[PDB]
Amino acid sequence: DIQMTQSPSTLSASVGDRVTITCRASQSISSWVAWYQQKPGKAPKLLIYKASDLETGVPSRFSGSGSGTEFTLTISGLQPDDFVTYYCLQNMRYWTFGQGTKVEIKRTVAAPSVFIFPPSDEQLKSGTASVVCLLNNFYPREAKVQWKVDNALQSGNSQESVTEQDSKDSTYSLSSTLTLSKADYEKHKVYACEVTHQGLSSPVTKSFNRG
Amino acid sequence: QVQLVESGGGVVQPGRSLRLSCAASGFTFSNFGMHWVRQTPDRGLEWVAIIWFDGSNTFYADSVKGRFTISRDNYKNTLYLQMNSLRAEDTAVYFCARSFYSDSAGSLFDYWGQGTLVTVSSASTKGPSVFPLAPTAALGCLVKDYFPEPVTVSWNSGALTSGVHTFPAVLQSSGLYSLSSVVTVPSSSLICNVNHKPSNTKVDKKVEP
């Protein structure tokens, strides 16, 4: 098969910028390259075909170039509605997409607002214990969370997710859930959440004595 | 206008089967080749199969050869996909896609459907347990142990919208999803509405400090 790889995976820019996404093929495919744009929850939309031909109705700020193995999509003057995901497709032998590139709004650094939540009592009588750590409205998206129980790291017993970039703050929010048994929960007392982010000049920890 | 509508998605036990349909309208279905394309949260866009306008030719991706079958009804104007021996790798949203060909462009996609989710899991449908996240002041709800997705969380019946963050769910080790939904209040403290469609569950929990 033919592989397709886009660079970079995530693009950070502001409205009005000129950005370029690069797509490289594992073998020469001449000019058989198209570019699709996917908005969250919606289907892909054709923008460029044949490396450099603009699809009808697509704004002129979109532009593509390339031949052989390397191909570039360029947006001269990013619009607010353009901060989505962009895929390149080969149509020489069958069809192969790239991994996609999210165009993200660049913003000033913003430290997270860290909150820790003890397990609900209705959940404790059920057998399991969940401890939620909330990292609210931060930028950039890169963040590190570590769970400490009586000053002891916790590996393989927590899961997290991050929201979409906010349409009003351009920030991110994270929530990590530490899942322990009731026996393991009432064995200790000091449950802490340590957060490392670029906006923090020092790691922050929000603790809660079991009670 | 062109309209492609997928249906038939749902939860399938590994090794069992499932068939997807796609109702086409707004154009001459009998003149266009049709595609199936799927999308995984962490694998991207993967082409599945293509069928000719008259159904004469048909090609599949290697990962489905022998298990999947693409058919077509040029009278009811419907595309079909018969999926046998479903694996976990097959869990994704399956898109209907009409083929576009020109001498300069080649074979491509132009009009797509809304997509339909296929979940290859061994779990049974279950309602979520809603636990409160009690308290420049943060509070929220925990939607734990439900299958399948999705759940719908709203605060004060769609009124308390500002400062709300409903997070993406996570698949736990039991095969059940869990989800957090937080909201910030001005510390002058003075109810989440979890609704799970498959289990017909509507839970409303109050969060007091």
Partner: peptide, 6 residues
């Protein structure tokens, strides 16, 4: 990829 249409 050949023409899958008419």
């Amino acid at each position: 990829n050949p023409d899958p249409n008419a």
